[PDB]
Amino acid sequence: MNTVPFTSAPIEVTIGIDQYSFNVKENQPFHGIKDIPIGHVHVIHFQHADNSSMRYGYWFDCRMGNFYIQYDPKDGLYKMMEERDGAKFENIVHNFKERQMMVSYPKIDEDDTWYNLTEFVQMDKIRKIVRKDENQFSYVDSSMTTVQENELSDPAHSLNYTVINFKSREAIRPGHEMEDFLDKSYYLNTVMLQGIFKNSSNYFGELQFAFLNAMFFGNYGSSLQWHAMIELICSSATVPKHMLDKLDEILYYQIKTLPEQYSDILLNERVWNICLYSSFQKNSLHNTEKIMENKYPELL
Amino acid sequence: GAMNSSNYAELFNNDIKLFVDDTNVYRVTVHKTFEGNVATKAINGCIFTLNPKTGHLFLKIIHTSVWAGQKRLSQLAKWKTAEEVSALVRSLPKEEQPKQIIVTRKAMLDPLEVHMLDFPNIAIRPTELRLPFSAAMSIDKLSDVVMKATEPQMVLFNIYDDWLDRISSYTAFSRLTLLLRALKTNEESAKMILLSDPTITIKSYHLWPSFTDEQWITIESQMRDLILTEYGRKYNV
Ligand SMILES: C[C@@H](C#N)CNC(=O)c1ccccc1
Ligand SMILES: C[C@@H](C#N)CNC(=O)c1ccccc1
User: Fold this and answer.
1) Could you list the residue range(s) of the whole structural domain that residue B27 is in?
2) How far apart are CA B57 and CA A60, in angstroms?
3) In Å, how far are A117, A207, A212, A226, B213 from A258, measured between CA atoms?
4) Residue B199 and residue A34: Cα distance in Å, rounded?
5) B114 to chain A: which residues are within 8 Å by CB?
6) Which of A3, A268, B189, B233 has the fewest Cβ atoms surrounding its Cβ within 10 A?
7) Crossing angle, helix A241-257 and helix A286-295, to 10 degrees?
8) Which domain holds residue A225?
């Protein structure tokens, strides 16, 4: 169980760690988060009390280094940093733990929610989508645009998600126009899975990463990516049975975790109605269809 | 964006554009089977591709053999239309290729877009107008070449005859749309108006009769009356 210490909390802020959150009062003696489960990526995220604009945060994996948070009064945000002096870090942590000024990652033992939301998300793959090679952790915020959003303006600050475009030469083989548009299996299985992603584990991971950034930061381009990756599978007549069964589990946990009062903005009516009721896979997502119908029957 | 009343004069500027109408591509007769069920029999169709500035009509005849053994024919028909329009564009010299293709039905947008991916600079546009191009098969010479076809064939016509020698494209298109609206609303009456006088003939190389300017005014008024009349006989006004 690892720890992310905080130097201090000089401004009042709501702090999230994965699906949990707590409010820290201005200058409240707070020194970080302990008992973080090893084996998963994590996200530590922030919303200032004065400016609910700009949710922002950091994806990290405590196996890759010792990370801490420190407020920067010039740039006006909580910044993640790496401490390279291993013994300095252990001594800081042990002192803050002895003084009981650390919130405890509050995982229930029955609860596999975080695993289920991050099964195929890796820190090495997150760094290939969020490019800042000098750091081992990755910053994301509400405003960052995607490569595809920019094609339609600061490149270093972009989410490089694999661009999916159903009316593009990449998606449509010459001479198979109608075939490939109405049945996207070629594009899913050959172009994306065999050619770009490399396996389904990587396709599921970017789809999971897209969802988490949409949910935690309200990142609009991330939501677009999540839905595009769902639609590409549901609109393929030929999908390996193991991928369909896994997709159903993935989406079930995403829909289960979504805050009810954000569904209006985070869920695209057209994609979900098409996917659950019209597409080739309309009958292959039993768990997802049951939770969607019992939790958001209005959208449908 | 969409083509409507507000941007109507754009049809007659000097940027090459084509209308594509697919309403006569897939044509069937519905009939009963010996067992008392219903079946369809396809008949030859056509794609109506028209340059509104010049009158040049590219009439691609769709022979019933293209449907043999195929499923979901109404959907296929849109993709077949898009395939043939794309093939036509590719066949034209670069300086003759359109800058815009306006589809008369919005369901043609995605099929045409996908087939024209190789032409990113050709805009594919819908229209808010309810244009009467379905009535093209009420022009006797066009219907005749479609029904006689025994194989796929492209036939070129000028749908304006020689009108552009005397009138502008705007006026020619307006006359065409009036004639076709009349043929669509009451084909028999409309054809009575056009051929009533045995002394006005259709030249071998033309589609419509050889009316003088004055006779065209009389004809055009008669077509308007019909379209209003029928609008009464239909709405009881
Ligand atoms: C009771 C504390 C002491 N000493 C340990 N709890 C916290 O630091 C904390 C808990 C919730 C919100 C913000 C901070
Ligand atoms: C852009 C390609 C790369 N790298 C494909 N994306 C992934 O493999 C991936 C991206 C994020 C999380 C998990 C997997």
Assistant:
1) 9-163
2) 64
3) 11, 15, 10, 13, 71
4) 101
5) 167, 172, 177-178, 181
6) B233
7) 20
8) 116-299
